[PDB]
Amino acid sequence: RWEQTHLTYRIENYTPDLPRADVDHAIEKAFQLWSNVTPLTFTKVSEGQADIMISFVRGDHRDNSPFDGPGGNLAHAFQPGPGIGGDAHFDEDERWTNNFREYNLHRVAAHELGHSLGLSHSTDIGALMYPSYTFSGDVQLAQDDIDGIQAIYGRSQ
């Protein structure tokens, strides 16, 4: 987990798959879920290192956790920590979207950010932290998600 509830994040590169604005939308919208229920606060920075580093990549991409091309593995984030910790990586061999068609960025990002903050997968099929991609018109967290994060960072209110 993170010591400070005030965290910075930065979209290092953008998937051309979408117009960058929608990319920022899907991200900020991802960070909101978690901010909506915990004392966590997020500031995106446009340059320099940030706590949560966000990037879209492929295959071997430095870290010892290479992507497998289209399909299969979609994304992976790192548990809270300096440097690589809290960092989230997206698989560019995927066709990232801002809609119902396969691999909706927002949805996956939300999940990834969950790991960035410390969370593990959920056994609740209805939780965002559940390890299987599925698309839902509304995308709010499950009781499971909220409970999970609030025991870590407390509650908002």
Ligand SMILES: O=C(CC1(S(=O)(=O)c2ccc(Oc3ccccc3)cc2)CCOCC1)NO
């Ligand atoms: O959990 C993972 C890796 C997986 S995955 O790529 O299929 C995957 C699955 C779902 C996911 O995020 C979502 C979670 C729930 C609904 C939508 C998206 C994000 C990644 C592939 C290996 O097994 C676990 C799921 N990364 O964080």
Ligand SMILES: [Ca+2]
């Ligand atoms: Ca980091």
Ligand SMILES: [Ca+2]
């Ligand atoms: Ca892949």
Ligand SMILES: [Ca+2]
């Ligand atoms: Ca792509």
Ligand SMILES: [Zn+2]
């Ligand atoms: Zn990676």
Ligand SMILES: [Zn+2]
């Ligand atoms: Zn996951």
